Amino acid sequence: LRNMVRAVVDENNQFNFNMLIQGGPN
Amino acid sequence: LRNMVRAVVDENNQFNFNMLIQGGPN
Amino acid sequence: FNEREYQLWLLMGSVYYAQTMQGAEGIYLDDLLGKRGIYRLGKTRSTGT
Amino acid sequence: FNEREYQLWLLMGSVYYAQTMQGAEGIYLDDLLGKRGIYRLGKTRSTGT
Amino acid sequence: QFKDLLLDPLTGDLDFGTPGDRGMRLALTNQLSLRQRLYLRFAIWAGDWYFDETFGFPYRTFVGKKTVKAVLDGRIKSEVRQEPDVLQITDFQSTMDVVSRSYKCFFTVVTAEGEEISLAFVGEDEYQYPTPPESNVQLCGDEGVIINFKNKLYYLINFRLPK
Amino acid sequence: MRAMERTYTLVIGRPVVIGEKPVNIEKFANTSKGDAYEIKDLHIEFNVKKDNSKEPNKGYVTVYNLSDEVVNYLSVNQRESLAVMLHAGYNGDEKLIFSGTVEYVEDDFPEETRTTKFILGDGTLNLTTATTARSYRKGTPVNSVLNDLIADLKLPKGRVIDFGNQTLQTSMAFTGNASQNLANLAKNTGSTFSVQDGAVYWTKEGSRFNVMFEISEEGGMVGTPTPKQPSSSKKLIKAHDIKEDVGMTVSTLLNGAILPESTVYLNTRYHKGFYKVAELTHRGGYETGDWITELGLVETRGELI
Amino acid sequence: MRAMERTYTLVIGRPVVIGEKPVNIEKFANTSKGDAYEIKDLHIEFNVKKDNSKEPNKGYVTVYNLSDEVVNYLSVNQRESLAVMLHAGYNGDEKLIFSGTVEYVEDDFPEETRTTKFILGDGTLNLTTATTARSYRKGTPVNSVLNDLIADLKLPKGRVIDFGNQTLQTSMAFTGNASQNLANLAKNTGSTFSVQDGAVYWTKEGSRFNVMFEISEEGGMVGTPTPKQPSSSKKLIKAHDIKEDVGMTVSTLLNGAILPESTVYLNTRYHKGFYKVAELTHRGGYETGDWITELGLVETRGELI
Amino acid sequence: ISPAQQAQADKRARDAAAAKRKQDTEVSNAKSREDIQYTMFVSGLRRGRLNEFERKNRTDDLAILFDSVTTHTYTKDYNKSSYAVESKAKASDHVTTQDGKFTFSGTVTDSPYLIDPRNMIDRDTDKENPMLARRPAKAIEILELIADSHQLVTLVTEDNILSNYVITSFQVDRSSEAGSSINVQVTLEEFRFRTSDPKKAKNANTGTKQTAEDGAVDDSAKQKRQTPYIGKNAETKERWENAAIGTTD
Amino acid sequence: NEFERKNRTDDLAILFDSVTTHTYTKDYNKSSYAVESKASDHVTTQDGKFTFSGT
Amino acid sequence: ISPAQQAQADKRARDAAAAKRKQDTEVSNAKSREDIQYTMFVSGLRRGRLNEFERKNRTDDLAILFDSVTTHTYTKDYNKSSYAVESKASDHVTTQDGKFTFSGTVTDSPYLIDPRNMIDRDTDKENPMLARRPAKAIEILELIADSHQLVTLVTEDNILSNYVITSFQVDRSSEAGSSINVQVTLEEFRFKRTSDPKKAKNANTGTKQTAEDGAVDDSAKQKRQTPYIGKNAETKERWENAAIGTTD
Amino acid sequence: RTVVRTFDFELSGYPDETFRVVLDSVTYELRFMWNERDESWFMSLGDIGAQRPTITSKLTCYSDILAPYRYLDNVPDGNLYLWPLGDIRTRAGRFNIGPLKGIQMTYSSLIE
């Protein structure tokens, strides 16, 4: 069942990475 | 059942703390 | 065959320390401290008044 | 079997040689003169006026 | 091997010993220690010893009440097995008399005997340190080497001639 | 004959106002009406972590089915910092377990049950707004600098270990938040600074204070101790040597009479010895849940201050 | 007749000590007693991610019901960096899958089952402490600067692509950690720098190395490939052009003989072609769980270096 | 309340506390004796397995027999993994073996037919007065002691012999349907895995060690008194330890 | 023997007109993973349950 | 305690430890040889399946026959997306592993004792109950399951291959005494050196270190170098040390 | 040379004990091996994770073990002795080492 939880945690980490790293010319 | 979820969230927080704070002489 | 040489190794190790400030025992102890002019005391008789 | 036995003779010879004055080296030197009751000195400090 | 002051099995006072060797003694053999460990455990009524309310036997439950023999035997037989060094109980003859209202049981207990681990705290030592020589024997030899040889020669001269 | 049942109490007081003297949350308990809003027999879930570091100790709380009047009193004062105290124990006494200000509050009431939320900070307001502006010349005794900065912070002095006859080697200037400047002086002098339940604690790393607490099966221990590293990373070593670097973990029934900087004695069947405390976490579920406390211990190698 | 069953081995060695020559984790495997603590038949769960970037590759591991002696050996050395190697395969061979130092370790033993935890770093100690202090004048050949900085890092050179006759245009100075300075030279010269399983890899972006691996239903593929963007954000474009910007994803049974900088050939029924590798993740549950590896591929548009 | 009621309150604490001491100490005695082994004869006693029942001496090898065993079962299990392939099918990977489980049901009657003294239940049972011997009760306090002390039981069944099994649960039902007897059910699972010669011993580990808690230096930490010496050989010790060891001050 | 000990003020006793069945049970649990080997500490004891029916 | 018990605890540990060496060893060798192939005959036999039953020898193709089989069932499963498809997109389905289960019995009073059955390898002809046949079957059953053999099932209609045992149950109820009821469950296995060089394919082994306890690995573990047996110490000696040197 | 008692040891009797101890704020690892023929304890001392022990010696009563070795940067400067609590004639044994078993192995540190 931990499989279900790991997926949601992974998605939240993905959203946070996107929030930090976005747009920009570099 | 929230006990199971809190454990996974705690482990993820631990991994992030390790990622931020690692190595270094100070 | 092997177990016997364990005894030989143990005895050899015992021999080496026989000539050191620590590990000396029995007769060998006298030689170590004999160099400094000290000898064991034998049987003694109680004295009093 | 003889090769395993031969090491025993070599070990005995080394032990005897290690404890003689001529063959005293490093720590083994400390033990031999330690038997006499004296020890090597250490970090020593200067004296002025 | 539990050590403790020895209690006289005959009187209940401390075993000061015979008039020729009066003193104080410690319980050393496991048999003697276990005897008194059971005696005290059975003699002290439950709750009557201060500093430990849980120690003792609850005689008040049975004495003075109409009780079933079988229940009493279980409790009697259970208190014995609280000691960690009891091997088994061999036999148990529980009998009750209704005329005098007395109850009296018999049984025996089997216990092994152990080793002493260390003699440092008790009396003696087991080693045989050597004795220093006497007079100029060390630097010049010993006469016994002559006496033993003379005796060997004499006994050999004795052997060959038939007797 | 009874059972051994849990008990607790939660108190809410007036808004906290910082002035020109040390702040004591005790004196703000009473409300304008007098007696404070006390909440005893309602299912409560809380989590309170404590540590010895710059950051304040923060605790979380949840209460179910509060009366409308109490919620109204918190709808007001949403611009202000209400003082709150929490108590817990076992049916015969309750030890202070947290005291601070209500940083956050929100209410969600979907259909059947309302659920109030709190976030509390231990001296957050003082530690994050106390400005300073100080300077000193070569030769100034360091023991004077320490006392000057702490008085600026406006908090009671729980315990301090003075430096002796230490003197500054170079001119120094301090500005910004006082807490940040003090936390920097910690690194260069081997001292630990951390505020807790309103008390300022200044100690020296590696050293420890008597057996103020003993842990054993009689003392309500929960499971055997296990060795856990006190940090999530490893440092390079020459292999100050006196610093920490080792620890252990233990759990026990809830007991609020413990603080991060205290000392404990561990009487178990495997592990035996003395340890410092480094971290605390108090958990609680009144109707359902644990009622225990977790301690993170750290080995010590310094003098017995 | 047998089945196809999993196998693995885990080894723990002496503390790692950095000196004045390249570090090889291989030589630290043997313990003072000689043979190392090997763990084979115990349920193990691990996750190992790898990448081509500044940060080291880190992997996590969990072991259940360890003997007290082994745990004791790790209670000690908690100040030190023990060397660890991991192997996995299928009942006939085991390929090296990770090698590094034990960054973290903790034990929790609630009632029935103890659970040990690990966090391992691939060369973390070297990448985060190797200081440098170098300078060069106008006209210096860039190929000399690269070699000078790598030797400072004290790691074996897995593979490097020299710059040719490039020369510095302006004077340069480098200090701080050597890894950080090298990672900055990457941006301004279109080169990729990343350490992995102790090997230093310096390559050029966009270009790729033969078909060192082929993926097909015979090669234990798991599901069809799907197109996934190689980054969580999009960059503005003129619409160096040679840079990455596209990729795909594939999954396969565990196979440790793969590295982020390698090249793979994808023989499926929909997608066919050559791709670079950009990311790896190895998962494993001995008694229960997956035993697969996930690859993140990136399209290439440069020369065939 | 009243002063007399204080005595009544004290009785609760003592008797309730004394009860657990008897249970707790007895369990502590188990797990300390390693020269004791428990065996249960589920079946086969009258067919071949009589050879093993003769080897037990009522002192360190003990046998558990039951007046009747209604049924017993044995079921081992295995786990099979499976992964998907691009062919819209599923393949297989390694498999694992999941220990094993055993259960049986039995009954102990208060009117036995076969009273064999070698059986450890019948240690004290009276030959000629069985119903007053409390056989049904006598079995609970012995079965419970085995389970709560975590003994590794060995089962001698007619079909095969099992070893290293740990009890997990059991039941006792005095239903009105039968009476004068107890219905007993038990479950077990396979718990699949100093002195002695220095030759066989290998390098052990103990980890970090603090000061010994049985001697001085802890008293200085615990703030206690050092134990005075017993005088013997005075003026010989005191000169040497005081110079070579000193005092904790 | 012990029923007669009960008075009417402190040691209150309760008797039902009839009890049909009563059951007593205990439980234990063990690790489901192979142990490292003796490591006989991998077991825990649960609380015993007791139930009965009456009228 | 006493030394008499120390001489008793050792017996308790020694005999118990001997049990693993017996059971644990047998499975090890059973997996170390893949030549043997086990087969099971559930029904099928008398409807012309005898054609392949006679092929089974007593050394490689072992066969198992139960005294009676009551029922056997075979089943397969599939799954599909529960959301409307985008439309033909007939790829939204997957195949699961087929399951097979049956119930049987082994009795102390057999009616047919055909020696070709591996249960009856060395069973007495005139006293079947002293042979203890039910115990013979269980010993066989655990070994097959423990070693993870890929069993082959011969059935009424079809033949199934590459099936592994996942669970079985044995019991001896009060009714049907002198016999045992047996249940088994099997599932498919989608399985996918000395070899002909013509069939060889490029392989990999990843990074490798010093192999096995050699003359160099011994130094790493501080083991003393293995003395050389003096079959010849005149030729290699002058060259071995000069060209290969010594680990030091 | 003023010295103060600061540490005591105990041995469980296992023939190959090995554990880590902290003395004078420094940490060391110790190994104890039991010799059958000579019925004596062999002690090895070295740094944590060291390839080989720095010092090896045989334990005896009333003998200064570290005497000839106070010239190395990784050897304690204190005093290590074994003396009995019971009768003075008792020699070191296997199980008789400890704060109350009969022999008191102790470490004491000079006052600086």
Amino acid at F242: I
- Burial code of G87-123, b = ≥16 C-beta within 10 A, e = fewer? bbbbeeebbbbbbbbbbbbbbebeeebbbbbbbbbbb
Query: In terms of Cα–Cα distance, which of J23, J109, J129, J6 is closest to J67?
Result: J109
Question: Scanning the structure block, which residue is given the tokens 């066969």?
Answer: J63
> Which residues of B make CB contacts under 8 Å with F?
14, 17-18, 21-25
Mind telling me how many Å the CA of E34 is from chain H's nearest CA? 16
Q: If you search the block for the tokens 């799954």, which residue do you land on?
A: J79
Please tell me which chains touch A, using 3 or more CB pairs under 8 Å as the contact test: B, G
Given a contact cutoff of 8 angstroms between Cβ atoms, the answer to whether C22 and K61 are in contact is no
Q: Which residues of E45-84 are buried (b: 16+ CB within 10 A; e: fewer)?
A: ebbeeeeebbbbbeeebbeeeeeeeeebbeebbebeeebe
| Approach to solving | cryo-EM
Please return the burial class of E163, using the count of CB atoms within 10 Å of its CB with bins 0-12, 13-18 and 19+. exposed
Residue I54, beta-bridge partner list: I19
Inspect the structure and tell me whether chains K and C have 3 or more CB pairs less than 8 Å apart. yes
| Interface test mutation site (partner F, options K22, K48, K74, max chain F beta carbons within 10 A) | K22
Burial class (CB in 10 A: 0-12, 13-18, 19+), H160: middle
How does E20-42 read in b/e, with b if 16+ C-beta sit within 10 Å? eeeeeeebeebebbbbbbbeeee
Residue B9 — φ and ψ, nearest 5°? -60, -40
Greatest Cα pair distance in chain I? 58
> What's the rounded Cα separation, in Å, for the pair E35 and E12?
12
Contact (CB<8Å) A25/G236: yes
CB-based burial label for J70 (10 Å; 0-12, 13-18, 19+): exposed
| Cβ within 8 Å, pair F210-H223 | yes
Look-up: residue for tokens 């500093």?
E51
Q: Give residues with Cβ within 8 angstroms of J7, minimum separation 6.
A: none
Q: DSSP states of G219-272 as a string? A: GTB-S--B---SSSS-------TTS---EEEEEEE---S--TT-EEEEE-SS-E
Q: Which chains touch H (3 or more CB pairs under 8 A)?
A: E, F, G, I, J, K
Q: How far apart are CA G50 and CA G245, in angstroms?
A: 19
Listed in sequence order, the residues at least 6 apart from D45 whose beta carbon sits closer than 8 Å to its beta carbon are none
Measured at the CA of H201, the angle between CA H198 and CA H204, to 5 degrees, comes to 120
d(CA E74, CA H125): 11
Cα gap I52→J15, rounded to integer Å: 44
**Is I35–H192 a contact, with Cβ atoms under 8 angstroms apart?**
yes
If you compute the radius of gyration of chain A from its CA atoms, what whole number of angstroms results? 12
K67 inside 8 A of chain D by CB? yes
Tokens representing residue F278 in the block: 């480094």
CB contact under 8 A, E130 and C26: yes
Question: Measuring CA to CA, which residue among H98, J190, B22 is closest to residue G287?
Answer: H98
Tell me the residue type at E113.
E
Tell whether E67 lies on the interface with I, counting CB pairs under 8 A. yes
- Give chain G's contact residues with K (Cβ, < 8 Å): 14-15, 32, 76-77, 79-80
C11–K59 C-beta distance less than 8 A: no
- Of E160, E32, E45, nearest to E85 by C-alpha is E32
Contact B8, A5 (CB under 8 A): yes
Nearest one of J10, E97, F272 to H200, comparing CA atoms: J10
From the list K22, K48, K49, which residue is nearest F301 (CB)? K22
Contacting residues of H for I51, CB less than 8 Å apart: none
| 3-class secondary structure per residue, chain E | CCCCECECCCCCCECCCCCCCCCCCECCCHHHHHHHHHHHHHHCECCCCCCCCCCCECHHHCCCCCCCHHHHHHHHHHHHCCCCCCCEEEEEEEEECCCCCCEEEEEEEECCCCCCCCCCCCCCCCCCCCCCCCCCHHHHCCCHHHHHHHHHHHHHHHHHCCC
| Chain E adjacent subunits, 3+ CB pairs under 8 A | C, H, I, J, K
Distance CA F256, CA F277 (A): 14
- Residue K6: C-alpha distances to residues E95, F209, K9, K65, K109 (Å): 64, 17, 11, 17, 7
Q: Inter-chain contact F237–G75, Cβ cutoff 8 Å?
A: no
Cα distance between residue F137 and residue F171, in whole Å: 5
Q: Is F91 helix (H, G, I), strand (E, B) or coil?
A: coil
State the amino acid at position E9 in one-letter form: P
**Per-residue CA distances from J86 to G225, G270, J89 (Å):** 20, 19, 7
Instruction: Kindly compute the dihedral angle of the four CA atoms of residues E96, E102, E106, E109, in this order, to the nearest 10 degrees.
Output: 120
Asked if H190 is an interface residue toward chain I (Cβ–Cβ < 8 A), one would say: no
Which residues in chain J are contacts of E84 at CB distance < 8 A?
none
J243 three-class SS: helix
Strands F7-15 and F37-39: antiparallel
Q: Can you say how many angstroms the Cα of residue J95 is from the centroid of all Cα atoms in its chain?
A: 27
Out of H31, H144, H174, the one facing I21 most closely (by C-beta) is: H174
Q: Which residues of C touch D11 (CB under 8 A)?
A: 12
Contact between residue F191 and residue F165 where contact means Cβ atoms under 8 Å apart: no
Nearest residue of A to residue B5, measured between CA atoms: A5
The three-class DSSP label of residue G202 is: strand
- C5 close to D (CB below 8 A): yes
DSSP bridge partners of F226:
F249
The answer to whether residues G51 and G260 touch, using CB atoms and an 8 Å cutoff, is: yes
CB contact under 8 A, F233 and B22: yes
CA-based nearest distance E82→chain H, Å: 6
Q: How far is H112 from chain G (nearest CA, A)?
A: 40
CB J182 within 8 A of CB J103: yes
| CB–CB contact D12 C12 (8 Å) | yes
- Phi/psi for E160 (5° steps) reads -60, -45
Do F267 and F243 touch, CB atoms closer than 8 A?
A: no
Taking CA atoms, E28 is separated from C5, E14, E18, E38, E81, in Å, by 41, 14, 18, 16, 21
Q: State the count of interchain CB pairs (< 8 A) between H and K.
A: 86
Q: Which position has the token pair 């002095």?
A: F157
Residues of B in contact with A2 (CB under 8 A): 4, 8
CB K108 within 8 A of CB K5: yes
- J neighbours by CB contacts (3+ pairs under 8 Å): E, G, H
F165: left (phi > 0), else alpha (psi -120 to 50), else beta?
alpha
Rounded distance between C-alpha atoms, residue C17 and residue K58, angstroms? 7
Residue type, E119: L
G41: nearest Cα among B8, F241, H193: H193
- Long-range pairs of K58-66 with CB within 8 A, sequence gap ≥ 24: K58/C17, K58/C20, K58/C22, K58/C23, K59/C22, K59/K92, K59/K105, K60/C22, K60/C23, K60/C24, K60/C25, K60/K92, K61/K91, K61/K92, K61/K103, K62/H240, K63/C21, K63/C22, K63/C23, K64/C21, K64/C22, K64/H244, K65/C22
CB F286 within 8 A of CB F65: no
Contact (CB<8Å) K68/D41: no
Distance of residue A18 Cα from the nearest chain B Cα, in angstroms: 16
> Does the distance separating the beta carbons of B24 and G60 come in below 8 Å?
no
Enter the tokens of residue K92: 């070191």
Q: Are residues H247 and K34, on separate chains, in Cβ contact within 8 Å?
A: no
What is the torsional sign of CA J108, J114, J117, J121? positive
Using a CB-CB cut-off of 8 Å, the residues of chain E touching J1 are 85, 112, 114
Are residues H245 and K10, on separate chains, in Cβ contact within 8 Å? no
Residue-wise DSSP of H3-54: HHHHHHHHHHHHHHHHHHHHHHHHHHHTTT--S-EEEE--S-TTTTTHHHHT
Residues 16-35, chain I: which have Cβ within 8 Å of H? 20-30, 32, 34-35
Which residues on chain K are in Cβ contact (under 8 Å) with E123? 87
Residue C14 to residue K35, Cβ atoms within 8 A:
yes
The whole-angstrom separation of Cα F62 and Cα F49 is: 15
Q: Of G262, G198, G239, which Cα lies nearest the Cα of G25?
A: G198
Q: Look at G1 and J37 and tell me if their CB atoms are within 8 Å.
A: yes
Please state whether F154 falls in left (phi above 0), alpha (psi between -120 and 50) or beta.
Answer: left
Quick check: G236 and A24 CB within 8 A?
yes
Q: How buried is B8 (Cβ within 10 angstroms: 0-12 exposed, 13-18 middle, 19+ buried)? A: middle
Q: How far is CA C34 from CA D35, E133, F271, J220, K66, in A?
A: 11, 14, 47, 45, 22
For testing the chain H interface, which of G2, G5, G269 should be mutated: the one with the most H CBs within 10 Å? Answer: G5
Strands F199-204 and F157-160: parallel
Instruction: Please check whether residue E65 touches I, CB under 8 A.
Output: yes
**Interface contact K71-D39, CB threshold 8 A:** yes
CB pair distance less than 8 Å for G256 and J31 = no
Rama region for J221: left / alpha / beta (φ>0; ψ in -120 to 50; rest)? alpha
Q: Do F239 and K48 touch (CB under 8 A)?
A: yes
Which of H36, H64, H68, H67 minimizes the C-alpha distance to H143? H64
DSSP strand pairing (J37-41 vs J151-154): parallel
CB contact under 8 A, D35 and C15: no
CA distance G71 to F291: 29
Q: CA quadruple F261, F262, F268, F273: dihedral positive or negative?
A: positive
Judge whether K53 is closer than 8 Å to chain D, CB to CB.
no
DSSP conformational letter for F16: P
First-to-final CA distance of chain B: 41
Three-class DSSP category at F297: strand
* Amino acid at residue number H58: R
> Which residues of chain K make contact with H216, given a CB cutoff of 8 A?
5, 8, 99
Contacts of G29 in chain J (CB under 8 A): 209, 220
* Integer Cα distance of K67 and K78 in angstroms: 9
CA dihedral G137, G138, G142, G145 (to 10 degrees): 10
The H or E element containing residue G189 is none
| For G32, nearest residue in chain H (alpha carbons) | H203
Contact between chains at E132 and C27 (C-beta distance less than 8 A): no
